[PDB]
Amino acid sequence: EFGSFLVSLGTSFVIFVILMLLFTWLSRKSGNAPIYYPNRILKGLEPWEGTSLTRNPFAWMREALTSSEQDVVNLSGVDTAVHFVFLSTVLGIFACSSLLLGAVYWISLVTYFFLWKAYKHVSSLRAQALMSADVKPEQFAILVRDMPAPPDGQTQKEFIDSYFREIYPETFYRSLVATXXXXXXXXXXXXXXXXXXXXXXXXXXXXXXXXXXXXXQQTAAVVFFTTRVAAASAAQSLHCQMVDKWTVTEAPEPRQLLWQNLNIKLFSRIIRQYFIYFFVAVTILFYMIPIAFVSAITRTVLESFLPQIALIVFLAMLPKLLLFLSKAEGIPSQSHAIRAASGKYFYFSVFNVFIGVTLAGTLFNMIINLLATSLPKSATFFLTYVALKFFIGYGLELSRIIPLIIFHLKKKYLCKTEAEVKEAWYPGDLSYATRVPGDMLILTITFCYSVIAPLILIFGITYFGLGWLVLRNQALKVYVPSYESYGRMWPHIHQRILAALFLFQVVMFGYLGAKTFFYTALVIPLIITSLIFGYVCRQKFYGGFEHTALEVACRELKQSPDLEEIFRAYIPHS
Amino acid sequence: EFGSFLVSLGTSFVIFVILMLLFTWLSRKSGNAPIYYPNRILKGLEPWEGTSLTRNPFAWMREALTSSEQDVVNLSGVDTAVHFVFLSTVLGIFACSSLLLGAVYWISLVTYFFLWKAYKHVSSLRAQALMSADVKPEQFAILVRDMPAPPDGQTQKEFIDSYFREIYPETFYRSLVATXXXXXXXXXXXXXXXXXXXXXXXXXXXXXXXXXXXXXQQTAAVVFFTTRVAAASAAQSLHCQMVDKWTVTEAPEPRQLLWQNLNIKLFSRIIRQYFIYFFVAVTILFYMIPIAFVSAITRTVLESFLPQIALIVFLAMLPKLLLFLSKAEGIPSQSHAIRAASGKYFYFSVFNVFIGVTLAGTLFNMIINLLATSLPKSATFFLTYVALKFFIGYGLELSRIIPLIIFHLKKKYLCKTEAEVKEAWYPGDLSYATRVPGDMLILTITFCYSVIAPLILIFGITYFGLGWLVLRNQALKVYVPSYESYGRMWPHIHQRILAALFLFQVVMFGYLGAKTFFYTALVIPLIITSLIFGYVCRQKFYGGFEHTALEVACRELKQSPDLEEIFRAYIPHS
Ligand SMILES: CCCCC/C=C\C/C=C\CCCCCCCC(=O)O[C@H](COC(=O)CCCCCCCCCCCCCCC)COP(=O)([O-])OCC[N+](C)(C)C
Ligand SMILES: CCCCC/C=C\C/C=C\CCCCCCCC(=O)O[C@H](COC(=O)CCCCCCCCCCCCCCC)COP(=O)([O-])OCC[N+](C)(C)C
Ligand SMILES: CCCCCCCCCCCCCCCCCC(=O)OC[C@@H](O)COP(=O)(O)OCCN
Ligand SMILES: CCCCCCCCCCCCCCCCCC(=O)OC[C@@H](O)COP(=O)(O)OCCN
Ligand SMILES: CCCCCCCCCCCCCCCC(=O)O
Ligand SMILES: CCCCCCCCCCCCCCCC(=O)O
Ligand SMILES: CCCCCCCCCCCCCCCC(=O)O
Ligand SMILES: CCCCCCCCCCCCCCCC(=O)O
Ligand SMILES: CCCCCCCCCCCCCCCC(=O)O
Ligand SMILES: CCCCCCCCCCCCCCCC(=O)O
Ligand SMILES: CCCCCCCCCCCCCCCC(=O)O
Ligand SMILES: CCCCCCCCCCCCCCCC(=O)O
Ligand SMILES: CCCCCCCCCCCCCCCC(=O)O
Ligand SMILES: CCCCCCCCCCCCCCCC(=O)O
Ligand SMILES: CCCCCCCCCCCCCCCC(=O)O
Ligand SMILES: CCCCCCCCCCCCCCCC(=O)O
Ligand SMILES: CCCCCCCCCCCCCCCC(=O)O
Ligand SMILES: CCCCCCCCCCCCCCCC(=O)O
Ligand SMILES: CCCCCCCCCCCCCCCC(=O)O
Ligand SMILES: CCCCCCCCCCCCCCCC(=O)O
Ligand SMILES: CCCCCCCCCCCCCCCC(=O)O
Ligand SMILES: CCCCCCCCCCCCCCCC(=O)O
Ligand SMILES: CCCCCCCCCCCCCCCC(=O)O
Ligand SMILES: CCCCCCCCCCCCCCCC(=O)O
C-alpha cells in the first residue's frame, strides 16, 4: 500500500538521519572512542589520522572511499576483503541492469560476466593471501576420526601412533587424542570472604572433574606433520581400505576446532545428519506460520512497521538455532559450522521468505492473469524491508547506539577494574553467520523481482552501495576477526548468487508464461546455461578453495617452524 | 502370444541341446583343444586333468562346480572373480524372492541384504588382492594433464621437470611427455619380390613420419615416483591453485593407457563431454525407432524369432559406437572407457529396451485399469528373450562353434606359419564392455517384473545360475584377461543393481497405484530407503575402490623396484 510505503520510508529515513547526526556528533567525542574506533584502539592506532583534532563531519566517507582492497586485507583479513568483493560484485551487476532498465538475458549475461570475473578475482586474491602467509599450526596438521578401538593390552594413543608411524615413518611428529566436558565446566567455575570459600570449592570440583577426564575409548586425534607439504598431502589421502576407519581431513585452525564433536563416529554422524536435516526441514515447515502472519498483516501504524518487525523477530532467532544444529551434526570446525548455518538459513530465505511471503501475499488477492498481476505488488513490502535495513539497520550499525548505551552503563555501575571495562567494549567480529545470510536474502528478492517490479533494483543498488560504504567504515574502524578462513566462504557465496540467478531465470520462465508470452521457451537456454556455467566454474576454480596447492605449500620458509608450539596450540584447558 | 512362446522355447531348447552335444563330442577331440581349452594351453596346462583320456561327458560340470572363488582369482584375476560375485549375488536374490513367490518389501530387503554383504565381500576381496600384489609400473606413477605452455627459451619437458621437482624434490624420477599418430600408422605399415619393395617403401614412410613426430607444444606427461606411497599421495593431491593447470590423477595400467587422448585440454574435454553426451542422448532418441519395430512385430515364424533377432542386431552395434564415443571424450584409460561405455549402454537398457519395449507394447493394447492389465503381458517377450540368451547364447558360448569354424578355415587355407595359426585361435578376454551391459539388461527386466509377471523370476534364476556354470567353465578354460582393474568394476555394478531396484520400487509404487491400491504410499519409504542405502554404502565402501589405501601402499617390499623398467613400460613404439 502506497501511503504506508511512504510512511515507512519516511520514518526509516528520518531515523537514519538522526542516527547519522548522533554518529557525527558522538564519534568526534573522545570518550566514545572505545565504541567508534575499537579496531584501531586494539591495534595501537590513533582513533583517526587527521591530528588537527577538528574532524570534518564527512571525513569518514572520504577515508572509506579512498581505501583499496589491499588496505582492507592488510588491516582486517581476507575474509573481510571477500565480503567487500561480494558487496561490490552485486552492486556492479545491479547498476548494469538498471542502465538497461529480453532484460532477462541482459541481466543473466551481466551476472555471468561478473560472477566469472569475481570468482577469478577472488581465486587470485586467495592465492596471493596464501602465498604470503606466515607459519601457522593448521598448516602442519590433520584431523583423524573414526579410529577403531585398540586391541587388548594397548591404549588408544599407542594405537594411533602405531598406525600413522607405519604409513608416514619419517614425517610424523605427534598425535593428540581428543579426550572432558565435566572438567571444562568445573574448571570454568574455578576460574570465575564467602566468595573465596566458593572459589576454593570450585577449584576442588575442578580437580575431581579433571580426574574423571583422566579416567576417560576415544575415536579421534589431531596429527602433526613436520612439513606443510606432508600435511597437505596426508589430508588429501585415503589411509585404509575400509573407508570408515581412520578417516582424515585437514585440521581446523586451533581457534575453530569444535572439540566436543570429534568423537562422534561416522555412522553416528550420518544418523545425526539425517535427524538434523530432518528437523530443519520440519522447522522450515513450522516457520510457514510466522510467515503467514507477516503476509496477512501487509492501520498505517501496523502496516508500516509490524510486518517488518515481526519478520525481523522471527528470522532473528534462526542463526542461533541453526548454528547449534550445525554443531550438533558432528562438524569439526567453526567456519564450517557457520557456512552450514548460512546454508540452512538460505533454505529459509528461499522457502519461508521469498517464496513464503510472495506466495502468501499472492493468495490474498483468467486465474493465471490475476496471479501475474498480483505477484509484482509484493515488491512494495520488500522495498520497505530493504530500506528498513539500509536506513535503520545501517543507521544503528554505524552509530552504534545500542553498544554505546550498554557500555557506559556497565562502565559506571558494574565494572570495577580496567579489565572489566575493556571486556565491556570488545567489538566482536563481523558475524558472518548472520550477516552473509542477511545479504543473501536481499539478493534473492532483488534478483527475483528485477524485471517484475524493477524499482527494486534501485533499492538493491542502494542497499549494496550504502552497505559497501557503511561496512567499509566498520571493517576498518570497528570489527575484529575471530578466525581466518582465507576466502573459503567465496564458493558458498558464488553458488548462492548463482542459485539466486537460477531461481530468477526459473521465475521469469514461469512469469513470462503467466503473461502467456510466446517465447518463454527462449529462457530455457538460460536455465541450462546457468547450470553449465556453475559446472564449468566449479571445474575451473572450486578445488583451489578446498586445499592449499602444493605449489603454495612448497613456499620457501622464512625460518624452520617450532613444532612443539604448533602442538601446544591445539591443547585446550592447559 | 502362447503358441509363439512355446515355439521359441522349443527351438532355443533344441538348439541348446544340439550345441551341448556338439560340445560334448568336439571338446573331447584333441584337435579342437586350441578352441575349447586355450586358457589352459596358454598357461602351459594340460587341456584337462583326468589323464585317463576317457573324459566323462559331465566332467566339466563337476569341475566348474567344485571350484572356489579363490581358484577363479588365482587362475583368471580379480575382475573375473568379481564377475562371479555379480552373477551369484543376483542368483541369491532371485532365489530368495521365489521362495516367497508386500513381496516388494521382501525383495527389497533381500536385495539390500545381499548388496550390503556383496559389497562388503568384494571390498574384502579387493583389499586382499591389492594386499598381495606384486610390483607393477602403475603403482609408481601419475598422469599429469593440462600443462601450460612453457616460457620462451624452455621446452615442454624441461618445464614439467621443473614444476614437479620443486614440489617433490626427492621423490621424483621421470617425466614422459605424451608426444605421433602418423608415426604409429606408418610404423605399423612397416612392421606389416614386390612385397619386399613394398616393405622398403613402408619403412621409408615410417622414418618420415617419425621425423614429423620428433618435430612435434604438448600438454600431458606421465610422471614417475620412487615409491608407491608417494605416487599414491601425489595422485590424490592438488598441485596448483589454478585448478585447470597441471591436473593430476593415478596413471592407468600401461596396457590401458589411451595415449591419443592425453593432450586434450580440460576445456576441450568439457566441450567434448557435452557434445558426446548430447550425441548419445540423440542416439537414444533415434533408437526409439528400432525399438518400435521390435515391439510392433510381437506368423509364428516371425513372432518367435524376428523381434528377438532384430533387437539383438540393433543392440549389438552399440558397444562399438559407445566405446568409440567414450574414448572420444578424452578418457585416459581403457577400463574407464569401458565402464563409461557400459554406463551409456545402461541408459539404452533403461530407455530403449525396458521402458521402450514395455511402453510400446502397452500402447498396442478405465484407461488406468487397461494399462495395468496390459503391462504384464510384455513379460512373455522378455521370457523368450532371456531364454534365447541362456539357451542359444550360452549354447554358442560353451560350444564355440563359430570360433571353431573360422579357426579351422584359417588354419587350412590362410595360415602359412605357426605364428599365424596361433593368432587365429587367440581367445580374447571376457569382453566386459558387452558382457556386463548384457547381464545388466537381464536384471533390469527381471527386477522390474518380479512381482508383476513373477514367472520371469524363474527365468532370471536360470539365466544367472546357468550363466554361472557356463561362464565358470569359460573363465577357467577359455578366456584370457587383457587388463586388471582389481574390482574397480564393482561400484559400477553395485550402483546399477541398486538403480534397478530403485526403478523396481518406483515401478511398483506406480503399478500398485494403477491397481488403485490403498497403501501404495508404503512403498515411498522403500524408495527413500534405497537412496539412503546407496548413500550409506557409498560412504562406507566406495572410496576404497578409487584409491589404494596408504596402509596397502606401505606394504613391505619383496625387493626394490626397478624404476627404469617401470619407465620403459610406458613408452609406446620403442
Ligand atoms: C539508470 C542507472 C544509472 C547509473 C547506475 C546506478 C548506480 C551506480 C552505483 C554505484 C557505482 C558502481 C560501482 C561498480 C564496481 C564493480 C567492481 C568492484 O569490485 O568495485 C570495487 C568497489 O567500488 C565501489 O563500488 C564503491 C562504492 C562507493 C559507496 C556508495 C555507492 C552508491 C550508494 C548510494 C545511492 C545510489 C547513487 C548512484 C549514483 C549514480 C573497486 O575495488 P576497491 O575496493 O579496491 O577500491 C575502492 C575505491 N578506490 C579505487 C577509490 C580506492
Ligand atoms: C520356490 C523356489 C525354490 C528354491 C529356489 C530356486 C532356485 C535356486 C538356484 C540356485 C542355488 C542358490 C545359490 C545362492 C548363492 C549366493 C552366495 C554366493 O556368492 O554363492 C557362490 C556361488 O554358488 C552358486 O550359486 C553355484 C551355482 C551352480 C550352477 C547351477 C545353478 C542353477 C541353474 C539351473 C536351473 C534352476 C534349478 C534350481 C533347483 C532348486 C559361492 O561361492 P564360491 O564361488 O567360492 O563356491 C562355489 C561352490 N563350491 C563351494 C562347491 C566350490
Ligand atoms: C502439504 C505440504 C505443504 C508444504 C508447503 C511448503 C513448501 C516449501 C518447503 C521446503 C523444505 C526444504 C527442506 C530442505 C533444506 C534443509 C536440509 C539441509 O539443511 O541440508 C541440505 C545440505 O545442502 C546442507 O549443506 P551445507 O552444510 O550448508 O554446506 C555448506 C558448505 N558446502
Ligand atoms: C517429444 C519427446 C519424446 C521422448 C521419448 C523418449 C524418452 C526417453 C529418453 C531418455 C534420454 C536419456 C539421456 C541421458 C543419458 C546419456 C548421457 C551420458 O552418457 O552421460 C551421463 C553420465 O552419467 C555418464 O557417466 P559414466 O562415464 O558412465 O561413469 C562410469 C564410472 N563412474
Ligand atoms: C540520504 C542522505 C541523508 C543525509 C544523512 C547524513 C547527514 C549528516 C550531516 C552532518 C552535518 C554536520 C555539520 C557540522 C559542522 C560542524 O562541525 O560545525
Ligand atoms: C535520540 C538519542 C537517543 C540515544 C541517547 C544519546 C545520548 C548520549 C548517550 C551516550 C552517553 C555518552 C555521551 C558522551 C560522553 C562524552 O562526552 O565523552
Ligand atoms: C542462452 C545462451 C547464453 C550463453 C551466455 C554465456 C556467456 C559467457 C559467460 C561470461 C564469460 C565472461 C568472460 C570474461 C573473460 C575475462 O575478462 O577474463
Ligand atoms: C551483458 C553485458 C556484459 C558486459 C558488462 C560490462 C560492465 C562494465 C565493465 C566492468 C569491468 C570491471 C570488472 C570487475 C570484476 C569484479 O571485480 O567483480
Ligand atoms: C528422520 C529419519 C532419520 C533417518 C536416519 C537414517 C540413518 C542411516 C544410518 C545408517 C547407519 C549404518 C551403520 C553401519 C555400521 C557398519 O556396518 O559398520
Ligand atoms: C523432512 C525431509 C528432510 C530431507 C533431508 C535430506 C538430507 C539428505 C542428506 C544427504 C545428502 C548428501 C550430504 C553430504 C554432506 C557431507 O558431505 O557430509
Ligand atoms: C530424513 C531422511 C531423508 C529423506 C530424503 C532422502 C534423501 C536421500 C539422500 C541421498 C544422497 C545420495 C548422494 C550420493 C550419490 C550416490 O549414491 O552416488
Ligand atoms: C515512529 C514509530 C516507530 C516504530 C518502530 C520504529 C521503526 C522500527 C525500527 C525497529 C526495528 C529496527 C530493526 C532494524 C535492524 C535490523 O535489521 O535488525
Ligand atoms: C527452482 C530453484 C530453487 C532455488 C534454491 C536452490 C537451493 C540450493 C542452494 C545451492 C546448493 C549448492 C550445493 C553444492 C554444495 C555446497 O553448498 O557447497
Ligand atoms: C543452452 C545450451 C548451451 C549453453 C552453453 C553455456 C556455456 C557457457 C559456460 C561459461 C563459460 C565462460 C568461459 C569464458 C572464458 C573466456 O572467454 O575468457
Ligand atoms: C536342460 C538340460 C538339457 C540337457 C543338455 C545336456 C545334454 C548333454 C548330454 C551328454 C550325454 C553324452 C553321453 C555319451 C557317453 C559316451 O561317452 O559314450
Ligand atoms: C550342426 C553342426 C554344425 C556345425 C558343424 C560341426 C562339424 C565339425 C566342424 C569343425 C571341424 C573340426 C572337426 C574336428 C577335427 C578333429 O577330429 O580333430
Ligand atoms: C521402509 C524401511 C526399510 C528399511 C530396511 C533396511 C534394512 C537394512 C539393510 C540390510 C543390512 C544387512 C546387514 C548384514 C550385516 C552382516 O551380515 O554383516
Ligand atoms: C528379507 C530376508 C533377508 C534374509 C535373506 C537370507 C538369505 C540366506 C542367507 C545367505 C547367507 C550367505 C551370504 C552371501 C553374501 C554374498 O556373498 O553375496
Ligand atoms: C550440444 C551443446 C554443447 C554445449 C557445450 C558446453 C561447453 C562449455 C565449455 C566451457 C569452456 C570454458 C573455457 C574456459 C577457458 C578459460 O577461461 O581458461
Ligand atoms: C540432449 C541432452 C543431453 C544432456 C547431457 C547432460 C550432460 C551433463 C554432464 C555434466 C554432469 C557431470 C559429469 C562429470 C563427469 C566427469 O567427472 O568428468
Ligand atoms: C548438452 C548440454 C547439456 C544440457 C543439460 C544441462 C546439464 C547441466 C549439468 C550440470 C552439472 C552440475 C554438477 C556440479 C554441481 C555444482 O554445480 O555444484
Ligand atoms: C528354426 C528357425 C531358426 C531361426 C533362427 C534360429 C534361432 C535364432 C538364433 C539366431 C540368433 C542367436 C543369437 C543369440 C546369441 C546372442 O545373444 O547374440
Ligand atoms: C526412475 C528411476 C530411473 C532408473 C535409471 C537410473 C539411471 C542412472 C544410473 C545410475 C547412475 C549412478 C551415478 C553415480 C556415478 C557413477 O555412475 O559411478
Ligand atoms: C524411509 C526413511 C527411513 C529409511 C532409513 C534406511 C536406513 C538403512 C540404510 C542401510 C544401513 C544398513 C546397516 C547394516 C549394519 C549392520 O547392522 O551390520
* Single-letter code of the amino acid located at A236: Q
Measure CA B58 to chain center. 30
Q: Do A266 and B233 touch (CB under 8 A)?
A: no
DSSP state at residue A545: G
The ligand whose atoms approach the alpha carbon of B505 most closely is 23
Chain B interface, mutation test: which of A131, A228, A243, A244, most B Cβ atoms within 10 Å?
Answer: A243
* Phi and psi, residue A257, nearest 5°: -80, 120
Q: What angle do CA B326, B327, B328 make, to 5 degrees?
A: 90
Q: For every residue of A102-128, which 3-state class applies, written as one string?
A: CHHHHHHHHHHHHHHHHHHHHHHHHHH
Chain B nearest C-alpha distance from A425 (Å): 40
Which residues does residue B176 pair with via DSSP β-bridges, in sequence order?
B222
Contacts of B243 in chain A (CB under 8 A): 539-544
Nearest to A544 among B236, B241, B543 (CB): B241
- Which residue on chain A is closest to B538 by alpha carbon? A243
d(CA B393, CA B478): 16
SS3 assignment, position B318: helix
Neighbours of B442 (CB within 10 A): 22
Nearest to B233 among A233, A270, A549 (CB): A233
DSSP state at residue A48: -
User: Torsion angle, CA of A394/A397/A399/A403, rounded to 10 degrees?
Assistant: 150
Ligand 21 pocket mutation, candidates A490, A528, A536, criterion most atoms within 8 A of CB: A528
Q: Do B239 and A546 touch (CB under 8 A)?
A: no
8 Å CB contact between A288 and A352: yes
For chain A, the distance separating the N- and C-terminal CA atoms, rounded to the nearest angstrom, is 61
* Single-letter code of the amino acid located at A188: X
The minimum-distance atom of ligand 6 relative to the CA of A30 is 18
d(CA A90, CA A84): 10
The minimum-distance atom of ligand 24 relative to the CA of B524 is 1
Chain A nearest C-alpha distance from B113 (Å): 18
Give B23-92 as a DSSP string: HHHHTTSGGGHHHHSHHHHHTT--S-S--SS---TTHHHHHHHT--HHHHHHHH-HHHHHHHHHHHHHHH
Chain B nearest C-alpha distance from A281 (Å): 16
User: Torsion angle, CA of A189/A195/A200/A204, rounded to 10 degrees?
Assistant: -40
Whether A274 contacts chain B with CB within 8 A? yes
Cell numbers standing for residue A54? 577538528
Q: What residues have CB less than 8 Å from B250, skipping those under 6 apart?
A: B138, B141, B142, B143, B231, B232, B235, B547
CB within 8 Å of chain B, chain A residues 220-239: 229, 232-234, 236-239
Whether A547 contacts chain B with CB within 8 A? yes
Ligand 5 pocket mutation, candidates A14, A18, A19, A20, criterion most atoms within 8 A of CB: A20
d(CA B250, CA B248): 7
Cell numbers standing for residue B131? 594386499
Residue A379 alpha carbon to ligand 7 centre in Å: 30
d(CA A24, CA A60): 9
Q: Do B549 and A240 touch (CB under 8 A)?
A: yes
Residue A533 alpha carbon to ligand 14 centre in Å: 6
8 Å CB contact between B243 and A543: yes
Q: Do B233 and A237 touch (CB under 8 A)?
A: yes
Whether B431 contacts chain A with CB within 8 A? no
For ligand 21, atom 6: residue with the closest CA: A528
d(CA B404, CA B415): 15
The ligand whose atoms approach the alpha carbon of B308 most closely is 22
8 Å CB contact between A78 and A125: yes
Task: For chain B, give the longest Cα–Cα distance.
Answer: 85
8 Å CB contact between A481 and A430: yes
* Single-letter code of the amino acid located at B536: V
8 Å CB contact between B142 and B249: yes
Regarding the beta carbon of A275 and ligand 10, being less than 6 Å apart is answered: no
d(CA B514, CA B452): 12
d(CA B234, CA B96): 46
Q: Do A541 and B243 touch (CB under 8 A)?
A: yes
CA neighbor of A141 nearest in space, from A226, A218, A220: A226
Cα–Cα distances in Å, from B503 out to A287, A451, B506?
Answer: 35, 41, 5
Q: Which helix (H) or strand (E) holds A477?
A: helix A456-477
8 Å CB contact between A314 and A467: no
Contacts of B552 in chain A (CB under 8 A): 241
Nearest to B536 among A163, A270, A551 (CB): A270
**Given the C-alpha cell 522447522, which residue does it identify?**
A283
For chain B, the distance separating the N- and C-terminal CA atoms, rounded to the nearest angstrom, is 61
The minimum-distance atom of ligand 5 relative to the CA of A56 is 17
Nearest to A232 among B237, B536, B554 (CB): B237
Cell numbers standing for residue B538? 557409498
Residue B267 alpha carbon to ligand 19 centre in Å: 6
d(CA A5, CA A455): 13
d(CA A144, CA A246): 6
Size of interface A-B (CB pairs under 8 A): 109
Whether B532 contacts chain A with CB within 8 A? yes
Neighbours of B153 (CB within 10 A): 6
Length of chain B: 574
The ligand whose atoms approach the alpha carbon of A122 most closely is 8
Documented resolution in Å: 2.6
Give A153-202 as a DSSP string: T--HHHHHHHHHHHHSSSS--EEEE---HHHHHHHHHHH--HHHHHHHHH
Nearest to B243 among A163, A233, A543 (CB): A543
* Phi and psi, residue B359, nearest 5°: -70, -45
d(CA A326, CA A318): 12
Cell numbers standing for residue A352? 519461508
The minimum-distance atom of ligand 10 relative to the CA of A269 is 18
Task: For chain A, give the longest Cα–Cα distance.
Answer: 85
Structural domains in chain B, CATH included, are 2-49+57-136+270-568 (no CATH), 137-261 (3.30.70)
Angle separating helix axes A2-26 and A379-388, nearest 10 degrees:
10
Regarding the beta carbon of B17 and ligand 15, being less than 6 Å apart is answered: yes
d(CA A328, CA B351): 43
d(CA A101, CA B37): 79
Regarding the beta carbon of B531 and ligand 11, being less than 6 Å apart is answered: yes
Q: Do A550 and B243 touch (CB under 8 A)?
A: no
Nearest to A549 among B127, B240, B548 (CB): B240
User: Torsion angle, CA of A77/A79/A82/A83, rounded to 10 degrees?
Assistant: -110
Nearest to A554 among B167, B274, B543 (CB): B167
d(CA A496, CA A12): 29
Chain A nearest C-alpha distance from B392 (Å): 41
Contacts of B237 in chain A (CB under 8 A): 232-233, 236-237, 547, 550
* Single-letter code of the amino acid located at B314: F
Chain A nearest C-alpha distance from B237 (Å): 6
Q: Where are the beta strands (DSSP E) in B230-384?
A: 247-250
d(CA B500, CA B35): 36
The ligand whose atoms approach the alpha carbon of B109 most closely is 18
Give A258-295 as a DSSP string: -GGGTT--HHHHHHHHHHHHHHHHHHHHHTHHHHHHHH
* Single-letter code of the amino acid located at A275: F
Q: Quick one: residue B444, left, alpha or beta (phi over 0 = left, psi -120 to 50 = alpha)?
A: alpha
Cα–Cα distances in Å, from B34 out to A198, B26, B27?
Answer: 94, 12, 10
Cα–Cα distances in Å, from B182 out to A4, A463, B185, B216?
Answer: 78, 62, 5, 11
Q: Do A551 and B232 touch (CB under 8 A)?
A: no
CA neighbor of B296 nearest in space, from B240, B378, B410, B196: B378
Burial tier of B34 (Cβ tally within 10 Å: 0-12, 13-18, 19+)? buried
CA neighbor of B14 nearest in space, from B24, B6, B3, B25: B6
Chain B nearest C-alpha distance from A243 (Å): 6
